[PDB]
Amino acid sequence: NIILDLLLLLLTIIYSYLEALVKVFFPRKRKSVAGEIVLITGAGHGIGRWTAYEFAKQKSRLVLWDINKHGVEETAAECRKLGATVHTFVVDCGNREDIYNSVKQVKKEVGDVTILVNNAGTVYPADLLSTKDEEITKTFEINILGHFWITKALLPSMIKRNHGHIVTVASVCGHEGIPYLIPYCSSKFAAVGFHRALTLELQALGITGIKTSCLCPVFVNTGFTKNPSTRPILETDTVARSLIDGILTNKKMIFVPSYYNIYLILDKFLP
Amino acid sequence: LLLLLTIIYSYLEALVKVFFPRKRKSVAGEIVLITGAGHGIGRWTAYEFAKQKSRLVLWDINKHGVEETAAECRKLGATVHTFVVDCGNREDIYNSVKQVKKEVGDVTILVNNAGTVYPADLLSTKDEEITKTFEINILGHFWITKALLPSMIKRNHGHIVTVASVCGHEGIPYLIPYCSSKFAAVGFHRALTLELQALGITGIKTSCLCPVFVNTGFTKNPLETDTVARSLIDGILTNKKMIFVPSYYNIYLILDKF
Ligand SMILES: NC(=O)c1ccc[n+]([C@@H]2O[C@H](COP(=O)([O-])OP(=O)(O)OC[C@H]3O[C@@H](n4cnc5c(N)ncnc54)[C@H](O)[C@@H]3O)[C@@H](O)[C@H]2O)c1
Ligand SMILES: NC(=O)c1ccc[n+]([C@@H]2O[C@H](COP(=O)([O-])OP(=O)(O)OC[C@H]3O[C@@H](n4cnc5c(N)ncnc54)[C@H](O)[C@@H]3O)[C@@H](O)[C@H]2O)c1
Ligand SMILES: O=C(NC[C@]1(O)CC[C@H](COc2ccccc2F)CC1)c1ccc(O)c(F)c1
Ligand SMILES: O=C(NC[C@]1(O)CC[C@H](COc2ccccc2F)CC1)c1ccc(O)c(F)c1
């Protein structure tokens, strides 16, 4: 217990310092996203909202979607103060029909989205037998099925121009199971799979201009879930910074904190 | 290079399997519910359970195919009950669980095998088919497990078998909706294992079957059915959590993480 704490803590410093060393010695080049049409779902609060702020500083043209009218317009007001041109829409990102109709409006009002951030998410923590079936369905409808309908609507223009970036906001819950989050983990594993199979298909289809990134943070202080009872302290602006740095550098799998990948590599060796 | 790692891992495993073997439990007299048992993996898994002397509950939307499996199981000496159930339909699942309870009793081993696939690139897929894929390959696992888990918990004895794929571990072009639904099946199994553990439920075991392509006619040809059914039964009896078919496929998965 004292031995395994000091063992993994040393690697939380070893992997982290090794990465910050390679990041200066052999760096990945940063692209520009200025003037790109960025659509962010769940832009009304938390990660989506702070990702919208990063894109506003990057000089992108923003399209913000959310079911919360007040929340998304509040993010847009901050983005406009940052100097960005912003369009907001009230869209249920778990509703296939609402998504398609809103994509026609985005096309007519702004133009063709070049960067899609599938951020909107839901969760109803409970043990399997305490979950409501309506909750399981909502979780899948928003966390994964919505990613299909939005990507399918926006991908044809990106393919035609051979230029785009599909950003999947998953979780470390898409890599490991967590108790009381069975429907949620399952939907997040589905998001990781969509990103992986999408990357491989574009490659197989000879589509070189469309990039893919998958954001996998640990618990974040956004109010999305109730703070763990007794238990890595992660703030919203840190996650939004990690995501923007990942997108600009065309990084496929963005773990937040980046060192979290050692636990994932370790699990693939355990008895 | 990789052809050698395949022979090395395979022979290392067959060596440990005789030197330090896992003990095999009995499933004789257990009430085993197998979904999509009207053909392929589910059918040949039903045959393995019939030889194991289990009581069988076979579900499928293919009535003729499921009664054909049942006839073979009965020849093998097993008692078998068949039901025509859409394992992607929540209402049909719940009503059928009422009928299973009234006619057979409490299921102790659940095999979530029923599955669907519509190969096509993302932009060629039909939205109705993406929904069907999720409804059957994962959402159905929630409704069936939720219905059958309460009796297993009460008795602290059960086994939840998730039939996923290597597609639940790696992405495949032309199988985006399918891979996504299979990743969801792997995640359900992983989070379910960890939750039972956290809740102090020691008697309920979990296994996840992840085969590569199998010659069942599930998809057009780019591993035989009886081989997969044998691997699954050997995995269940030995309480193995992750059953890759072929078992050596795990080296490619360990390699991808580097
Ligand atoms: N918070 C964490 O601990 C954590 C960790 C890892 C990953 N994530 C993921 O990050 C994403 C954003 O979560 P967050 O922590 O910023 O949460 P949040 O509660 O701060 O905000 C999520 C936003 O999504 C919106 N939304 C919900 N349902 C929607 C729908 N049907 N249509 C449109 N918008 C909808 C909400 O209105 C809200 O503004 C989610 O996909 C979540 O699963 C969160
Ligand atoms: N065949 C492969 O290459 C392969 C590889 C890995 C995993 N798998 C998985 O193995 C499982 C079984 O596939 P298979 O290869 O034996 O296919 P199969 O075609 O031989 O049979 C699948 C069975 O599922 C039944 N089914 C389909 N929809 C159903 C529904 N709504 N309700 C009830 N039953 C339903 C079908 O009637 C059929 O009998 C699936 O979960 C599949 O995804 C298959
Ligand atoms: O950890 C996240 N939230 C915190 C919770 O809200 C509260 C704690 C429970 C886990 O509780 C236990 C775990 C193991 C044993 C016993 C527990 F009780 C998960 C939900 C969380 C939620 C979304 C994410 O996307 C994410 F990465 C992390
Ligand atoms: O491999 C399985 N089926 C085979 C196909 O039926 C036919 C080939 C395509 C993949 O094609 C390509 C992949 C990469 C590059 C170029 C391709 F053309 C998948 C579907 C298969 C199907 C279910 C499973 O569960 C599984 F594990 C495997």
Numbering used by the authors:
A (entry chain B): 2 to 232, 235 to 274
B (entry chain A): 8 to 229, 237 to 272
Paper text:
Hydroxysteroid 17-beta-dehydrogenase 13 (HSD17B13) is a hepatic lipid droplet-associated enzyme that is upregulated in patients with non-alcoholic fatty liver disease. Recently, there have been several reports that predicted loss of function variants in HSD17B13 protect against the progression of steatosis to non-alcoholic steatohepatitis with fibrosis and hepatocellular carcinoma. The overall structure of each HSD17B13 subunit could be divided into two parts: (i) the catalytic core domain (residues 29–259) that contained the cofactor binding site and the catalytic center and (ii) the membrane anchoring domain that consisted of the N-terminal helix (N2-P28) which was highly hydrophobic and a C-terminal proximal helix-turn-helix motif (P260-N286) which formed an amphipathic patch on the protein surface.
Compound 1 bound to both subunits of the dog mutant HSD17B13, displacing the C-terminal peptides from the substrate sites of both subunits. Missing the anchoring to the substrate sites from the C-terminal peptides, the adjacent P274-N286 helices in the helix-turn-helix motifs became disordered. Compound 1 binding also rearranged the P218-T239 loops, which interacted with the C-terminal peptides in the apo structure. Within the loop P229-L237 peptides became disordered, and the side chain of F220 adopted a different rotamer. The combined effects of G177E and V178G mutations made an outward shift of the 177-180 peptide away from the ligand, leaving more space at the active site of the mutated dog HSD17B13 for inhibitors and substrates. Dog mutant HSD17B13 bound compound 1 strongly, and only slightly less than the human HSD17B13 (dog mutant HSD1713/compound 1 Tagg: 46.8 ± 2.2 °C; human HSD17B13/compound 1 Tagg: 49.1 ± 2.0 °C; unpaired t test p = 0.016), indicating that the mutations introduced in dog HSD17B13 based on compound 1 interactions increased its binding affinity. All of the residues interacting with 1 were from one subunit, except A205 (human sequence), which was from the second subunit of the HSD17B13 dimer.
